[PDB]
Design a protein around this ligand. Sequence first.
Ligand SMILES: *OCCCN1/C(=C/C=C/C=C/C2=[N+](CCCO)c3ccccc3C2(C)C)C(C)(C)c2ccccc21
Ligand SMILES: [Mg+2]
Ligand SMILES: [Mg+2]
Ligand SMILES: [Mg+2]
Ligand SMILES: [Mg+2]
Length: 760
Amino acid sequence: MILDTDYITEDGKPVIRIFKKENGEFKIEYDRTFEPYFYALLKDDSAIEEVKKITAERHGTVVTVKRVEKVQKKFLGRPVEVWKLYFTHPQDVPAIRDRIRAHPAVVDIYEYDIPFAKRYLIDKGLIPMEGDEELTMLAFAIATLYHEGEEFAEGPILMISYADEEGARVITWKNVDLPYVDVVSTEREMIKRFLRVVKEKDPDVLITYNGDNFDFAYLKKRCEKLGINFALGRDGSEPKIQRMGDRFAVEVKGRIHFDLYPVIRRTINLPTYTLEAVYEAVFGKPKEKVYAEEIAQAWETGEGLERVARYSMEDAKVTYELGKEFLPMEAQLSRLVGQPLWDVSRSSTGNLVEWYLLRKAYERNELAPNKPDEREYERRLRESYAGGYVKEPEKGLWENIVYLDFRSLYPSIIITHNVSPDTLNREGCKEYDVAPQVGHRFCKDFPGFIPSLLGDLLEERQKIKRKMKATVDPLEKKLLDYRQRRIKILASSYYGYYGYARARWYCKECAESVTAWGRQYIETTIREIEEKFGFKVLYADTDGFFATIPGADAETVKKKAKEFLDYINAKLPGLLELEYEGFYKRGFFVTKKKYAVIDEEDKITTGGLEIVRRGWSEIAKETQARVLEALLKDGDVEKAVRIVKEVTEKLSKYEVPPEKLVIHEQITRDLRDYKATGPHVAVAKRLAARGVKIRPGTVISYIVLKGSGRIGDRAISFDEFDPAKHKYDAEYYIENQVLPAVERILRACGYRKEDLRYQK
DNA sequence: AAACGTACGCAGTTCGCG
DNA sequence: CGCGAACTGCGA
Ligand SMILES: *OCCCN1/C(=C/C=C/C=C/C2=[N+](CCCO)c3ccccc3C2(C)C)C(C)(C)c2ccccc21
Ligand SMILES: [Mg+2]
Ligand SMILES: [Mg+2]
Ligand SMILES: [Mg+2]
Ligand SMILES: [Mg+2]
């Protein structure tokens, strides 16, 4: 099993390191024969001798062309003749590529910015994470001493916990009487003890939750202050911080640092992504959270540290269990993309596509297009195109609703209509498909590059969807459901890649052709179900719609829906397939992107509602949730109205706990870059002026008090709320929080109650 | 050096124009 | 003051 690859430099020459696990043993395979290269398209063959003499410099090293070789390749399927330029070191290429491209006889250069380690795995046909080798894993977490206004890692680390199959333990330098706690005397001794534990256990995988941003950076800073060599790497190196765009990540040489946060963030849909919320969503069990202030109080007074040590232990325990569950999913994606799990688990879906395209292009001797330069990138950013079809929803509380959607609308269109940059407006093409409205022609004579790849990806998803249905175990079934959804989004991300400005295989004509065909197909299914089966489509968005037969009972709606599915699937061509998603006994559709339905098990699913979003207080979400249940489950409009009257009366009489009035909103930039100052920005600016560290990602938790001025003038951070001096704004939480969250819902059901609120 | 990206859509807060 | 634009943030 190949775990990872990188390169080092020995005496000026690059040495590829292949990190492997074979027969239960970690091994490093070295390759000193791999030469970096890129391609040059020349105006005339005779200029190659002048191109060979181009030189450059980098860090005191004179860069020259080592060897050139003429090769026959394809570019978007058409034969091309380019020169392969070899170099000694991969760092030579960035230093010299601009001067080579600037030569008057050089038309363009290609494949000049592919990282040396990824170039090696592609050109050698090597796939990570293959085989039956069992990987050893170890999760860890830290607890720190925090005080408001201090620099990052100004206070010491208090606890370091870890967990594997042998259990979970905590290392700390204060006496805590728990059997899983190991006590040392100083923070330095605890760090060095943790370093020892990792050395003796020698795990292949280090699991964290947000270790890319907090744990490793905190450990790093503390190790510099204490003079500790944090030699976590299998080659004796320290963890290395890396940067991708605006995100940071930490690698440990010879191992796989598996940070679960970017994995869970795009695998599960949750309102918040705390470790406690993630563990509860996956395993169905709650996890207690102990906050930084209680940790500091327990450590500094010495009272109540067992609770802190239990929280620290459970942090490591649930991180190991989560990592164990999600490793197989990310291992498969690593095999599918063809890049190490460290990169695949963190990289954007654009690179998940492009890294695979680069590998398949190499297998087919297809020259890769370049990432755009500054002018082309800006031009792609400005241009846009039409997207999915969204229908204005029908008002009212409807009954006996079916939701029908396409299995994989955009990948199906790409394959069926052969939508690819190498098939667009192809000369001398015999048979082609013309996209509606946008009019682009896609050749059908030969399968396009990208269409020829999506079919296998879709089948991999159907394989997981089959194993999911055949698995009775609820946890294993849920994990497979997470897995098949990741593959579905990855495949559909091929359409978005077509419109992504940084894409090598960018194709705006391809992107708007896919959406145009998508709009045509959903409008076709909508027209057919209404005309031929007497259905009424209530709401539709991009690849699915809600429909019913007005006045019919549940059995008739169900029976006629399957009949229509047989009818429409016979008509729909290629890979397009409409599916029976589910039946719902009641539902309403507030606006576009806003709806709520309930199945025959009384389970309420919603879309785009306030119960999920940030910026809404608990009293508003709770009241909305109770109104949803009263309308959907009980069908009782008078009960829903009664609930609103009771909640607004409780607010007017100050009987609602102020904890239910906290509003959480995230700061997304430096406070200087805000052009308008709203409630959460005004609070953040007031906090920062007092020494509180405000950074992008900081969540502001405020409450609106009775006072004067704008809402921002009345809002204060909830951590400073004192019920002895502060009285909250009851009129605000009624008129701006509770009422907007229920009034649109009740109106969408056809009930515009004048005096919903208590008194006024 | 490497780059978290597709269109469509709602809605709260703020504040000058007419 | 009604209205709407600008800003802001998030949600197939
Ligand atoms: O390499 C040839 C081009 C040189 N060049 C520039 C290079 C910038 C490199 C960025 C390095 C970097 N890393 C390491 C990359 C892997 O993450 C890193 C890791 C972690 C945190 C931060 C960082 C950074 C910040 C920056 C610059 C210097 C930009 C430049 C300017 C003009 C011409 C050539 C180059
Ligand atoms: Mg790497
Ligand atoms: Mg664009
Ligand atoms: Mg069909
Ligand atoms: Mg006027």
